Structure formats: structure tokens, C-alpha cells
């Protein structure tokens, strides 16, 4: 197959001369684009007459409707778009597409070659004839010109096109044609093809501009962003102007307690009113929040923080209806926060009763979350995985811990799809009596069945606890752990081994307290920026959605006030770190990475 596409102007003789580029071999078919002007109807009929007395290849003299003369830029734009559709329709394959530049206006030939470059062409050429004819314009003059070898062919060279423009097909952008005899009259209903081409070229420019430095982008899909947007990422995050952008971000939640979600306000009452046994509901205790909540004047400490959530949890979630409401409302909050992957921490043995074993509670929690996931479309679905919290308490009791670890080992094998149990969370009481090595023997069965481990080291400013968690419990993640910089060896080990650090900005500020909205960083600042500079995989989390009274968006924005000059690219980097640190399998991680590629487009850049 060899198809020749040739525009024609007043000089109809260009097409028969362009027919002779390949010599006696000729073209399998030639298709001619034409305008609607009346100055070229004699040329069109002469072309038809020449085609009649040189038959064998397919012929088309398709004329562009509503295009008489170049009045303004709109005529050129319409002609270009109709050219693109006609080129797709008549020469679907660029491997054998021959394009002639002779006919038409100067802009017509320039658009001919521009379309050749955009979509690809086997050869782009121009035909010239020596001016030694007349008393070629007529049939006999053209025949004499070809017989006497009076044709010059300048081949501008083959055009490879563009990778994502060569796959465009005629059905995607159809060209409506009205027959007026042996001549087609073509028109276009819209400018879809031109808009698609311009968007493609803009994206190609963005990718090629961001190509040098793609390894520094946490999300590779960001290379298609405009350079202004990429410069916007490296700017410091603005906590008030980036509310919408952070809100729309697909986020990863790795440290969220189920029992600390609907602890006060309207959510607590919504959970309570769904109880299956309202007469067994405990009275709502008066738990006054510290003034300025969620940003207290003075840090309140771990004891007061945990007491703030006394209205929900073991007291409330022993009711099956309260538990179901808690799970469904937590999933609704996750969907409202655009969380794409979440790991929820629960204590099923804390909610067990005489007739409801901890396995029953865990199965109910998992099924509630699975039903919530299934009721949600794939595009905006939040995948929820379960971590079981092994709480260590002052006193030495270890039977609830044994129940929780055994429950995790059983559930890790039970559910292989959907909501899964993916790890254990060693949490509870901070002291040198309840450090990691004390429970290092308890977690050998957890390591045998390939269950991941995360460890709270929140309150105790004890480097030894973090070291024991990393090396005696084989913890893959560390909860809080705000004093890694105290031991440079420990910080280097955490960064080298890929152990993720779960930071909870609002909860850390409420419990510990950090300098806020400071222009300079030193000796007291939130360690997020230093951890990132040290190569630590840092994740930002909510800890307790209810007690802290802040969502994931609020925590991400509070990182702007906690760390001076933290860039929003660093927010994306924390999201990527959390995606990598998730206790997810290959399918879950693939879905999460597909979700993370859809970074919201910023507004009011520069």
C-alpha cells in the first residue's frame, strides 16, 4: 500500500505531478483535499477528468466545507482540524503515507507538513515544474510535462510522528461527508481532535521539561505537571491557602485507633444512638476538653490525653450496634478525608463479652469494614486493613496480649482478600519495666507466621526502648518516636533499615508540645524535617481522630506550623513513605499506587 495525500489550490496540475513521485510504480491510491472556494471548481473538474483517463488507483477530491478564503485565523484553524481528520480517515497508517506540499495557500502547505510531523508520514515532498509550457495548466500540458521529464521532486524526509499521536484513528474523530457526485464535501462537528493534540503536546512538553530531575519527584506521574506547578511543589506549604489541595490529596493512614474516633461531639451521640441495647449504655461522663482544643495552651500529657477518650472504647464498643456504627462512621470519615489506604488499630478482646468472643468481635469489625469498602466504587474506595493492638499495662498481666497475638495469627491466615489483618501494634504503658525485650519472646509466633509489627514509643524519652523495638521485636514501623536524634547511631539505623516512623502531629503537639509558627528551627522543633533530612521514611497520621479532634488533612497542614518551611513536596514524600511502609500485599500496593498517581492540580500557583 502507498497512499498519497495532496492539498490542491488554484493549480490543479500539482496532483498529477505529485502522482509521479514514485515513477512508473505510482501510488495505490491518492486522496486530494480541497476547499469550498469557487475559484478551484474548474481545477476539481480537471482533476476528475484526469482521474478518468488515468484509472487504477482509488480517487478522492474531498472538499472542506465552509472554507472559501483565508478570512482570519478561524478559517485556518478549521482547515487544520479538518485536515487532521481527513488524514486519519484516508491514510490510517503513517508507514505508507505520502504528503505533498505543493497545493493550497502558504499556510495550507505549512499545515500539511505540520500534520505530517505530528501524525507521521512515509515521505513529505514538494513538486516543481519548469515554466516552459503554454502558448502545465491543461491536460495535454501536464502529459507533456510528465513525458518530457519536467518535474522536480524535493523530498523533505520521512516523519516519525509522535508516540501517542500515531495511534489516533478515524472513528475517534469522524469526518462527516456529504456526496455531491464524485466529490466529497467534508465537515467537522467539533474541534475535539485539535484540543486533544494540543493537550498531548502540552503534556509532552511537561514530561520532557521534567525529565531531567524525575528521580527527585516522589510520584513519577508528577513529571507531566507544568513547570510552574512543579516549582509550586518545592515552595513551603501554606496551612491556610493549601486547605483544599491537602484535602483533595489521596492520603495513606497508618496510625489510627478505632477506639478513639467517636469520643465526643455529635459523632459520639451518633454512635451511642445506634446501640443494640440502649439500656446498657454507660452514662455520658463529663470530659471537658482543654481550652483551645485541638491546640491547647499547654501540653496535657499522655494520662489526660487517654482520659479524654473515656466516653468511647471498651465502655461503648461492647455493644454490637455501637461497634458497627463506630466502624461505619470511621470509614465515612476516611472517605471524606480522601484516604486511599488505611490501617485501623483495634482491640477486639477489649470489646468481648460472655456471649461474644474476641474472634466474634474481630470478625464483626472486619466484616463491617469490608461491607463499607464493597459499598464504595473502586475509584474512591478506601482500603482498610486491620492491626491488632497488644496493650502492655502496669501490673504484669499478659493474657489479653496472648489473646490479641493469637487472634492476629489466626486472622492473618483467615482473610486473604479485602479487609485483612496485617500486623500487630505493641502499645500501652511506657516504662523501663514494659520495654520491648520483655515481650520479645511473645512475638516469635508473630514473626513465624510473617505478621508485621509496629511499636509505640511515644512518651518515654528512652532511646533504649526504640533500640529494643528495632532489634528485639523486629518492628517494621515505630509509633511516634520523637527522640531519634538523641542517638545518631539509632537514627542512622532507622534510616538504613527502612523502618518507618509514624508521626502524629496534632497528638504529638497535644501530649508533648512543640514550638509553633517559629521562623527558625532549633533544639525544640518537631523532628519531621530533620527526620526527612536524615533519610527516615516518615509518615503523618491522626493517632486518634476523636481525642485529637483533627483529621489527616489537619495534621498535614499542622506540619506547616510545626516545621518552618516544610514544602508540600515533602507532604507528597510522606504520602509515598506511608505507601511504601504499608503492611499491604502486591495487589493492595498496586491499587494504592494507582490512587496516589492522581495528585490534585494546584490552584493559584506562581
Residues that bind its own copies (CB under 8 A): 70-73, 75-76, 101-102, 105-107, 109-114, 117, 126, 128, 152, 154-157, 160, 162-164, 202, 204-205, 207-209, 211, 214-215, 220, 223, 444, 447-450, 452, 467, 470-471, 474, 476, 489-490, 492-493, 496-498, 535, 583, 586
Q: Which three cell numbers stand for residue 277?
A: 441495647
531-540 burial: b if 16+ Cβ within 10 Å, else e: bbebebbbbb
Assess contact for 582 and 254: CB atoms under 8 A. yes
Residues 375, 395: Cα–Cα separation, whole Å: 44
Residues 259, 370: Cα–Cα separation, whole Å: 18
Please, which residue, 211 or 288, has the CB nearer to its own copies? 211
Please, which residue, 72 or 523, has the CB nearer to its own copies? 72
Helices 139-147, 41-53: inter-axial angle, 10-degree rounding: 60
Q: Which three cell numbers stand for residue 57?
A: 488507483
Q: Which does 205 bind (CB under 5 to 8 A by kind): Zn ion, its own copies, none?
A: its own copies
Nearest distance in Å: CB 71, its own copies: 7
Q: Which does 208 bind (CB under 5 to 8 A by kind): its own copies, Zn ion, none?
A: its own copies
Is 54 among the annotated ligand-binding positions? no
Q: Which does 498 bind (CB under 5 to 8 A by kind): Zn ion, its own copies, none?
A: its own copies
Please, which residue, 26 or 294, has the CB nearer to Zn ion? 294
Cα maximum dimension of the chain: 118
Is 314 among the annotated ligand-binding positions? yes
Nearest distance in Å: CB 453, Zn ion: 15
Is 396 among the annotated ligand-binding positions? no
List the Cα angle 525/526/531 in 5-degree steps.
110
Chain-centroid distance, C-alpha 548? 29
Please, which residue, 25 or 215, has the CB nearer to its own copies? 215
- Beta-carbon contacts of residue 306 (< 8 Å; ≥ 6 apart): 547
Residues 466, 472: Cα–Cα separation, whole Å: 10
Residues 354, 351: Cα–Cα separation, whole Å: 10
Nearest distance in Å: CB 473, its own copies: 9
Q: Which does 543 bind (CB under 5 to 8 A by kind): its own copies, Zn ion, none?
A: Zn ion
Residues 502, 454: Cα–Cα separation, whole Å: 9
Residues 64, 61: Cα–Cα separation, whole Å: 10
Site for Zn ion in 542-601 (CB under 5 A): 543
Is 391 among the annotated ligand-binding positions? yes
Please, which residue, 114 or 270, has the CB nearer to its own copies? 114
Residues 137, 140: Cα–Cα separation, whole Å: 8
383-392 and 339-346 as β-strands: parallel, antiparallel, unpaired?
parallel
Secondary structure letter of residue 174 according to DSSP: -
Please, which residue, 295 or 302, has the CB nearer to Zn ion? 302
Nearest distance in Å: CB 553, its own copies: 27
Q: Which does 42 bind (CB under 5 to 8 A by kind): its own copies, Zn ion, none?
A: none
Is 456 among the annotated ligand-binding positions? yes
Residues 386, 419: Cα–Cα separation, whole Å: 7
Q: Confirm or reject binding of residue 502 to Zn ion (CB under 5 A).
A: no
Is 312 among the annotated ligand-binding positions? no
- Beta-carbon contacts of residue 312 (< 8 Å; ≥ 6 apart): 259, 260, 261, 262, 263, 268, 271, 326, 546
Q: Which does 416 bind (CB under 5 to 8 A by kind): its own copies, Zn ion, none?
A: none
123-129 and 151-155 as β-strands: parallel, antiparallel, unpaired?
antiparallel
Is 392 among the annotated ligand-binding positions? yes
Nearest distance in Å: CB 299, its own copies: 31
Secondary structure (3-state) at 122: coil
Nearest distance in Å: CB 503, its own copies: 21
Which residues sit in the known binding site for ATP?
A: 257, 259-260, 306, 314, 347, 350-351, 391-392, 430, 456, 543-544
Which residues sit in the known binding site for Mg(2+)?
A: 257, 259, 309
Contact residues for Zn ion, defined by CB under 5 A: 543
Which residues sit in the known binding site?
A: 255, 257, 259-260, 306, 309, 314, 347, 350-351, 391-392, 425, 430, 456, 543-544
Amino acid at each position: 500500500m502507498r497512499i498519497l495525500l495532496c492539498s490542491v489550490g488554484t493549480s490543479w496540475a500539482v496532483v498529477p505531478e505529485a502522482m509521479q513521485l514514485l515513477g512508473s510504480q505510482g501510488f495505490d491510491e491518492v486522496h486530494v483535499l480541497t476547499t469550498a472556494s469557487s475559484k478551484i471548481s474548474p481545477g476539481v473538474e480537471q482533476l476528475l477528468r484526469y482521474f478518468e483517463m488515468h484509472p487504477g488507483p482509488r480517487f478522492s477530491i474531498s472538499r472542506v466545507q465552509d472554507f472559501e478564503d483565508l478570512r482570519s485565523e478561524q478559517d485556518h484553524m478549521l482547515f487544520e482540524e479538518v485536515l487532521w481528520r481527513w488524514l486519519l480517515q484516508r491514510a490510517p497508517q503513517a508507514a505508507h503515507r505520502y504528503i505533498c506540499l505543493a497545493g493550497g495557500y502558504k499556510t495550507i502547505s505549512a499545515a500539511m507538513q505540520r500534520a505530517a510531523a505530528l501524525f507521521g508520514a512515509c515521505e513529505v515532498f514538494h513538486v516543481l515544474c519548469e515554466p516552459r509550457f503554454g502558448p502545465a495548466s491543461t491536460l495535454e500540458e501536464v502529459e507533456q510535462a510528465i513525458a518530457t521529464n519536467a518535474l522536480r521532486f524535493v523530498r523533505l524526509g520521512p516523519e516519525p510522528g509522535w508516540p501517542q499521536l500515531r495511534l489516533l484513528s478515524a472513528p475517534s474523530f469522524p469526518l462527516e461527508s456529504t456526496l455531491q457526485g464524485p466529490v466529497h464535501w467534508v465537515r467537522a462537528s467539533d474541534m475535539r481532535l485539535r484540543q486533544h493534540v494540543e493537550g498531548v503536546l502540552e503534556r509532552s512538553r511537561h514530561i520532557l521539561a521534567a525529565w531531567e530531575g524525575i528521580s527527585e519527584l516522589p510520584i513519577p506521574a508528577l513529571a507531566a505537571w507544568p513547570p510552574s506547578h512543579l516549582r509550586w511543589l518545592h515552595e513551603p506549604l501554606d496551612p491556610v491557602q493549601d486547605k483544599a489541595w491537602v484535602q483533595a490529596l489521596p492520603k495513606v493512614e497508618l496510625h489510627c485507633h478505632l477506639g478513639g474516633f467517636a469520643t465526643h461531639g455529635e459523632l459520639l451521640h451518633k454512635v451511642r444512638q445506634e446501640a443494640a441495647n440502649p439500656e446498657s449504655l454507660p452514662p455520658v461522663r463529663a470530659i471537658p476538653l482543654p481550652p483551645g482544643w485541638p491546640i491547647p495552651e499547654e501540653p496535657i500529657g499522655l494520662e489526660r490525653y487517654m482520659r479524654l477518650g473515656d466516653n468511647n472504647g471498651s465502655a461503648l464498643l461492647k455493644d454490637p450496634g455501637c461497634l458497627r456504627a463506630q466502624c461505619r462512621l470511621l470509614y465515612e470519615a476516611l472517605l471524606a478525608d480522601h484516604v486511599a489506604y488505611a490501617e485501623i488499630r483495634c482491640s477486639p478482646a477489649n470489646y468481648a463479652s460472655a456471649s461474644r468472643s474476641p474472634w466474634v468481635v474481630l470478625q464483626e469489625i472486619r466484616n463491617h469494614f469490608q461491607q463499607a469498602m464493597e459499598e464504595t466504587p473502586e475509584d474512591r474506595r478506601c482500603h482498610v486493613n486491620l492491626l491488632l493492638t497488644a496493650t502492655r499495662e502496669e501490673g504484669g498481666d499478659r493474657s489479653r496480649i496472648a489473646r490479641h497475638l493469637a487472634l492476629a495469627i489466626t486472622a492473618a491466615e483467615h482473610w486473604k482478600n479485602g479487609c485483612r489483618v496485617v500486623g500487630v501494634d505493641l502499645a500501652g504503658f511506657e516504662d523501663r519495666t514494659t520495654r520491648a525485650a520483655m515481650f520479645a519472646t511473645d512475638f516469635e509466633p508473630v514473626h513465624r507466621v510473617g505478621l508485621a509489627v509496629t511499636v509505640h514509643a511515644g512518651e518515654n524519652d528512652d532511646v533504649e526502648g526504640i533500640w529494643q523495638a528495632v532489634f528485639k521485636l523486629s518492628a517494621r514501623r515505630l509509633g511516634h518516636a520523637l527522640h531519634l536524634s538523641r542517638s545518631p547511631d539509632l537514627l542512622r539505623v532507622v534510616a538504613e533499615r527502612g523502618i518507618a516512623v509514624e508521626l502524629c502531629p496534632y497528638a504529638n503537639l497535644q501530649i508533648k508540645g512543640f514550638p509553633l509558627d517559629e521562623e527558625q528551627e532549633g533544639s525544640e522543633t518537631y523532628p519531621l524535617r530533620g527526620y526527612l533530612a536524615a533519610g527516615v521514611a516518615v509518615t503523618l497520621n491522626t493517632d486518634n481522630l476523636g481525642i485529637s479532634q483533627a483529621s489527616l488533612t489537619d495534621n498535614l497542614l499542622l506540619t506547616a506550623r510545626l516545621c518552618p518551611g516544610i514544602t508540600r513536596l515533602e507532604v507528597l514524600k510522606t504520602q509515598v513513605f506511608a505507601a511504601q511502609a504499608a503492611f499491604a500485599n502486591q495487589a493492595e500496593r498496586k491499587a494504592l499506587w494507582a490512587r496516589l498517581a492522581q495528585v490534585p492540580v494546584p490552584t493559584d500557583t506562581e
